A and B are shown apart, each in its own frame.
Chain A
Amino acid sequence: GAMNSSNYAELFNNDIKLFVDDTNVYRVTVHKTFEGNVATKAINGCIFTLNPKTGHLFLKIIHTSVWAGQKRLSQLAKWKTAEEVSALVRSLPKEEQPKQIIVTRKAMLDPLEVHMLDFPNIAIRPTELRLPFSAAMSIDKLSDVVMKATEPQMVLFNIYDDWLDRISSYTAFSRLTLLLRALKTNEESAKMILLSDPTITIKSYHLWPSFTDEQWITIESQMRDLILTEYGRKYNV
């Protein structure tokens, strides 16, 4: 059934599961033509497939070439997502195949379901959570690899860097969703907070700065304040 606040901790048990977010699969700039009409230009996108327990991210890069000569692209994008997720599953050894896949947008349930007909013991699940996974392209290294890609390419990352050496999945995921949520609500400030201190670097094999534990607490506080502020501004509360 649908994932929500109630069954939140199931994400961190030992049932392999993956989130699939398709928000950045079909990405366009909207521009005017010489005649003054509007036209879109596709840019590279990605499927964001993430094992919330382990931090393993399967960043399937969606090259603009996949759209060439295709109609109804925002609809196709959901089927292409589902096709690529299915191929990822098929590519994994059996014991690595997920028991659940939780799509972050309900529009993905049927495409994925139909693509997973060969895997009837894999539950395709919606979620009531407003996960901020769309802000994945606010992570510099992820945005860079997508933008530079010249072909379809799968790129593997651990979205938790090394956090799990010191914290739990649950905390790791909460740290991640807070960073991304702040990146989503005010990217510029969120990134400012992350690099304001030139002395805290991002390791070449990491996505996020190498904060000590105390510095993560301060960071998390700064992201929480950021998110709260933006809310008042949005609503005049």
Chain B
Amino acid sequence: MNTVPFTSAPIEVTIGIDQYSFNVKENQPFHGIKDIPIGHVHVIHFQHADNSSMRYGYWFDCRMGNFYIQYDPKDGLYKMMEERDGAKFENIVHNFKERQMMVSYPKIDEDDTWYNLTEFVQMDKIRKIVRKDENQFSYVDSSMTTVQENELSDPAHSLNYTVINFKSREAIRPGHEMEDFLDKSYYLNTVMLQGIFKNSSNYFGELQFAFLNAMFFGNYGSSLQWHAMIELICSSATVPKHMLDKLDEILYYQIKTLPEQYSDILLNERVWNICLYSSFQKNSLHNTEKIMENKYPELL
């Protein structure tokens, strides 16, 4: 079990870790989060009490180093940093635990939600989508745009998700115009699975990371990317049975975890009604379909 200490809490902020979050008052003595389950990626994220605009946060993995949060009064935000001095860090951490200034990552033991949301998410892959190779952790916020979004402006701050576009040469073989557009099996399995992602786990990882960026930061371009990767699977007539069963699980926990009041902007009516009711895989998403219906029958 690992710790992310905080130097201070100078400004009133709602801090989240994964799907948990705490209200922290201005100069409340808050000094970190402890008992963070080793073995998954995590995200610590922030929404200042004064600016309910710009949710931001850091993806990290505690195995990849010792990380702490410090408020920057120039740049105006909680910054993740890495402490290289292992001793100086166990020192900080143990002294804050003793003084009991740290919240416990509040995992219920029965609860696999975070594992299920992050099953396929690797920090090595996050760091390719969010390119900043001098940090082992990855900054994402509400306003970051995706590589696809920019094409249609600052590349240093972009989300380099894999471009998916159903009306592109990549997606459509010359001579199979009608086939490949009605049945994206080619684009999914040869171009994307075999070609770009290499395997289904990297694909599911990007999908899952895109969902989480949408949920935690309302990153609209991640939402687009999550919906694209679902639609590409659902619009392929020929999908490995294992990807289909895993996908139903993935989406179930994502739909399960979404705040109820957000279903309007995070969930795209067309994609879901097509995936659950019109696509080749209409009948392959039983869990995802059941929860969607009993929880958002309006959208449908």
* Contact in complex: A110, B181 (CB < 8 Å): yes
- B84 contacts chain A at the CB level, 8 A cutoff: no
Give B232 Cβ to nearest chain A Cβ, in Å.
Answer: 16
- A117 contacts chain B at the CB level, 8 A cutoff: yes
* Contact in complex: A79, B167 (CB < 8 Å): no
* Contact in complex: A115, B177 (CB < 8 Å): yes
Residues of B within 8 A of A113 (CB): 167
Nearest A residue (CB) for B179: A79
- B178 contacts chain A at the CB level, 8 A cutoff: yes
Residues of A within 8 A of B169 (CB): 117-118
* Contact in complex: B177, A110 (CB < 8 Å): no
Nearest B residue (CB) for A82: B177
Give A230 Cβ to nearest chain B Cβ, in Å.
Answer: 38
- B168 contacts chain A at the CB level, 8 A cutoff: yes
Q: Which of A76, A113, A114 has the largest number of chain B CB atoms within 10 A?
A: A114
Across the interface, A110 reaches (CB within 8 A) one of B167, B168, B174, namely B167
Residues of A within 8 A of B181 (CB): 110-111, 114
Nearest B residue (CB) for A86: B177
Residues of B within 8 A of A83 (CB): 177-178
Residues of B within 8 A of A114 (CB): 167, 172, 177-178, 181
0/1 interface trace, chain B 239-267, chain A, CB 8 Å (1 if under) = 00000000000000000000000000000
Across the interface, B168 reaches (CB within 8 A) one of A76, A82, A111, A117, namely A117
Residues of A within 8 A of B172 (CB): 114, 117
Nearest A residue (CB) for B175: A83
* Contact in complex: A111, B177 (CB < 8 Å): yes
The A-contacting residues of B in range 158-208, CB under 8 angstroms, are: 167-169, 172, 174, 177-178, 181
Nearest B residue (CB) for A80: B178
0/1 interface trace, chain A 5-46, chain B, CB 8 Å (1 if under) = 000000000000000000000000000000000000000000
B interface bracket (residues with beta carbon within 8 Å of A):
under 10
Residues of B within 8 A of A118 (CB): 169, 174
Across the interface, A79 reaches (CB within 8 A) one of B168, B174, B178, namely B178
* Chain A contact residues, majority secondary structure: helix
Measured in the bound complex, the distance between the Cα atoms of B172 and A118 in whole Å is 11
Residues of B within 8 A of A79 (CB): 177-178
* Contact in complex: B167, A76 (CB < 8 Å): no
Measured in the bound complex, the distance between the Cα atoms of B178 and A111 in whole Å is 7
Give A25 Cβ to nearest chain B Cβ, in Å.
Answer: 14
0/1 interface trace, chain B 16-56, chain A, CB 8 Å (1 if under) = 00000000000000000000000000000000000000000
Give A125 Cβ to nearest chain B Cβ, in Å.
Answer: 15
Nearest A residue (CB) for B169: A117
Measured in the bound complex, the distance between the Cα atoms of B181 and A76 in whole Å is 12
Measured in the bound complex, the distance between the Cα atoms of B237 and A6 in whole Å is 43
Measured in the bound complex, the distance between the Cα atoms of B172 and A79 in whole Å is 13
Measured in the bound complex, the distance between the Cα atoms of B174 and A118 in whole Å is 9
Give B125 Cβ to nearest chain A Cβ, in Å.
Answer: 30
0/1 interface trace, chain A 177-217, chain B, CB 8 Å (1 if under) = 00000000000000000000000000000000000000000
Residues of B within 8 A of A111 (CB): 177-178, 181
Residues of B within 8 A of A115 (CB): 177
Measured in the bound complex, the distance between the Cα atoms of B167 and A82 in whole Å is 14
Nearest B residue (CB) for A76: B178
Give B180 Cβ to nearest chain A Cβ, in Å.
Answer: 8
Nearest B residue (CB) for A72: B182
Measured in the bound complex, the distance between the Cα atoms of B173 and A117 in whole Å is 10
Residues of B within 8 A of A82 (CB): 177
Residues of A within 8 A of B168 (CB): 117
Residues of A within 8 A of B174 (CB): 118
Nearest B residue (CB) for A112: B177
Give B248 Cβ to nearest chain A Cβ, in Å.
Answer: 28
Measured in the bound complex, the distance between the Cα atoms of B174 and A83 in whole Å is 11
The B-contacting residues of A in range 114-132, CB under 8 angstroms, are: 114-115, 117-118
Give B282 Cβ to nearest chain A Cβ, in Å.
Answer: 17
Measured in the bound complex, the distance between the Cα atoms of B90 and A186 in whole Å is 90
Give A109 Cβ to nearest chain B Cβ, in Å.
Answer: 10
Give B179 Cβ to nearest chain A Cβ, in Å.
Answer: 9
Measured in the bound complex, the distance between the Cα atoms of B178 and A115 in whole Å is 8
* Contact in complex: B178, A117 (CB < 8 Å): no
The B-contacting residues of A in range 71-126, CB under 8 angstroms, are: 76, 79, 82-83, 110-111, 113-115, 117-118
Residues of A within 8 A of B178 (CB): 76, 79, 83, 111, 114
Chain A: residues with CB nearer than 8 A to chain B? 76, 79, 82-83, 110-111, 113-115, 117-118
A79-B178, A83-B178 provided; 12 other pairs, C-beta below 8 A? Answer: A79-B177, A110-B167, A111-B181, A113-B167, A114-B167, A114-B177, A114-B178, A114-B181, A117-B169, A117-B172, A118-B169, A118-B174
User: Can you pick out 17 interface pairs between chain A and chain B where the beta carbons lie within 8 Å of each other?
Assistant: A76-B178, A79-B177, A79-B178, A82-B177, A83-B177, A83-B178, A110-B167, A110-B181, A111-B177, A111-B178, A111-B181, A114-B167, A114-B172, A114-B177, A114-B181, A115-B177, A117-B167
Which 4 residue pairs across A and B have the least CB separation, nearest first?
A79-B178, A114-B177, A114-B181, A117-B169
